[PDB]
Symmetry: none
């Protein structure tokens, strides 16, 4: 039937166009997904590299606290010995 | 009225393809939300460390000066012995 087949290929156009829109949609989201992955990986590097600096510092700093508390004591004992 | 069979088959196909894309949109949307959550956290974690590292460096300087003074104040009482 002319009219049944008409509506059908008219529907075929409706669908095929709705489909490519959803297609263009998922790909758009897919891109965003990977874009964010890139950013997240960037961010993880930063944190890691800072944390590494912060450790080197906290370590070095901790070595001094030791030597200082050691020399502070000796100093106190030279002032003690004379009085 | 003979290809009308195949127009309907092509139609049901397309409809279904549309549905599968729909589900994809949904789950991608979820993933994305979960992701900026993570990204944001990471960025926040960085910001606290950078602060933490500035604090450390700063304290580490203060000490370095104190040590330098107390080690030179000690040399003048061990060169005396």
């Amino acid at each position: 039937v002319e009219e049944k087949y008409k509506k059908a290929m008219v529907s075929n156009a409706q669908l095929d166009n709705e489909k490519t829109n959803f297609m263009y949609q998922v790909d758009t989201l897919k891109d965003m997904l990977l874009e964010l992955e890139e950013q997240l990986a960037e961010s993880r590097r930063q944190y890691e590299e800072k944390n590494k600096e912060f450790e080197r510092e906290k370590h070095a700093h901790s070595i001094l606290q030791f030597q200082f508390a050691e020399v502070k004591e000796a100093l106190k004992q030279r002032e003690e010995m004379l009085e």
